[PDB]
Amino acid sequence: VEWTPCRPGGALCGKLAVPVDYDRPDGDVAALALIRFPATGDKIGSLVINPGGPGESGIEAALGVFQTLPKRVHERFDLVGFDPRGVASSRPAIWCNSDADNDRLRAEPQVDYSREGVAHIENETKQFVGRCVDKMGKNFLAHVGTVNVAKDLDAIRAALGDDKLTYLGYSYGTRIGSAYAEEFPQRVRAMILDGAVDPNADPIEAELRQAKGFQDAFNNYAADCAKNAGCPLGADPAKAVEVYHSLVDPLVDPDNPRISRPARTKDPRGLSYSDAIVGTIMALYSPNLWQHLTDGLSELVDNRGDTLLALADMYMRRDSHGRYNNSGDARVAINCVDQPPVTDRDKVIDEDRRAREIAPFMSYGKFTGDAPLGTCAFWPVPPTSQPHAVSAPGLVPTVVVSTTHDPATPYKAGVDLANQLRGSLLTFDGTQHTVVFQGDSCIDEYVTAYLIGGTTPPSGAKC
């Protein structure tokens, strides 16, 4: 790996070729992009990070992490971000949708689960899968899975001159962590995993727990808001969901649910129902975004939707010129090969029945007796991994950071992952997705002490 400065720090960038298929290392070849912020003191090794997603860029993540990095850590480690195979700047990058394909889906209310509606959604899914294959080919798509990201991580580890790996992973990055721990445990120096994914979970029960997560985050937000002047959800938090629907449901024609009635915005798109929901979901990632959600809902009282559209744009990674990065396309592709997809219609129909009851704020109208299959039920290449309990007996102790009311990756997953790893659980009291190197000085002391001196938080540690 030949290093070079970038086009924002003391940063160096580089590429590293890995085989696309790890059984055909003389066959097709991918190149991973790396960024590197040199250590300013006595160097221990490289701190390698992953932001999660999947489809999120680690290079763009390292630039953000750099600003909030404890001085002691920055003294002792290179901060290294990478882009996983198929993601952001790595080549080839997963592409399925044009920018116009994305806007077109986002203009639909996506709320009609009658048979016609479900056929329409399922038809759009098929054209999507087709567009993936046409642009990427069945070979590359077969190997974007985490099991192969883990193999690149060890190629990366070795390419930076470290005997063991020091690793920080958020969210989906947790799944990369435990995968690397299973296949290269003798190469793990240290590991922080914030916002856990449990590779042993049943996919449907996890989603329902995630729905519950977000309903619960919504509850918390709404209750906070209720104490504030002029709260758009009303002063009585037990009626928030209904008020919330009184604000978002008019965005759908009440006589034909395929017809969007979008709120006025300076942007030409306006605000669709599906964007309103996605905007809400985005804000519930972090209390830093609650002010924006409140602004967003306030605008809706006046039939405006500028702030919710911006929040949905943030989530979808659409910039001000209408260009999308590949995080959405890559997200789907990588998720589809990480585990067997649900193909049983009945168990998908029942999941919709349950989610409507668990997360009413997300659900429109009533249960219809029908629901669409997820994109992955139509994936042309098979999963490269399967739900199982993490078993990596000789792994060093690791730290798993879990937030009590995390909506994306709930507290319980964190607990369970820590058990399988038989490492330390560190608890954050809060309502957000992840917390490490994000301001909180208590979390950061524990993590800095672990990273440098290998010292783990004591059983029951909470912040």
Residue 301 lies in a domain: yes
User: Same domain, yes or no, for 58 and 109?
Assistant: no
Are 88 and 237 members of one domain? no
Question: Structural domain tally of the chain?
Answer: 2
CA-CA-CA-CA dihedral for 67, 70, 73, 77, to nearest 10: 0
- Phi/psi for 341 (5° steps) reads -75, 150
Annotated active-site residue 406? The verdict is yes
Q: Is 363 a catalytic residue?
A: no
Query: Do residues 448 and 401 lie in contact, with contact meaning Cβ atoms separated by under 8 Å?
Result: no
Residues 245 and 329 in one domain: yes
**Same-domain pairing of 47 and 78:** yes
Do the domain assignments include residue 5?
no
Q: Given the structure tokens 């992953």, which residue do they identify? A: 50
Whether 329 and 255 map to the same domain: the answer is yes
Which of 360, 387, 414 finishes a domain? 387
Residue 20's alpha-carbon distances to 155, 178, 215, 322, 420, in angstroms, are: 13, 21, 40, 31, 30
**Nearest residue to 13 via CA among 81, 67, 94, 75:** 81
Catalytic-residue membership of 352: no
- Pull the structure tokens for residue 429: 């009291």
d(CA 453, CA 448): 8
292 and 348 share one domain: yes
Ordered alpha helix ranges (H), 137-272? 138-142, 146-159, 173-183, 203-226, 240-248
Residues 250 and 349 in one domain: yes
Breaks (C-N over 2.5 A) in the chain follow: 7
Q: What are phi and psi of 380, to 5 degrees?
A: -80, -15
84 in the same domain as 127:
no
Parallel, antiparallel or unpaired: strands 12-19 and 29-37 = antiparallel
Give the CATH number, domain containing residue 152.
Answer: 3.40.50.1820
Last residue within a domain, chosen from 387, 403, 430: 387
Residue 445: which domain range?
Answer: 12-92+144-200+388-453
Q: Among candidates 356, 405, 386, 354, which has minimal Cα distance to 204?
A: 354
Same domain assignment for residues 115 and 212: yes
Cα angle for residues 366, 360, 354 (degrees, 5° grid): 70
d(CA 199, CA 335): 12
Q: Which residue is catalytic, options 275, 406, 416, 444?
A: 406
Choosing from 46, 57, 90, 171, which is the catalytic residue? Answer: 171
234 φ/ψ sector (left φ>0, alpha ψ -120 to 50, else beta): left
Does residue 71 sit in the same domain as residue 128?
no
Check whether residue 107 and residue 236 sit in a common domain: yes
Run of H or E residues at 14: strand 12-19
Catalytic residue among 112, 162, 433, 444: 433
Phi-psi region of 55 (alpha: psi -120 to 50; beta: other; left: phi over 0): left
Q: By what technique were these coordinates determined? A: X-ray
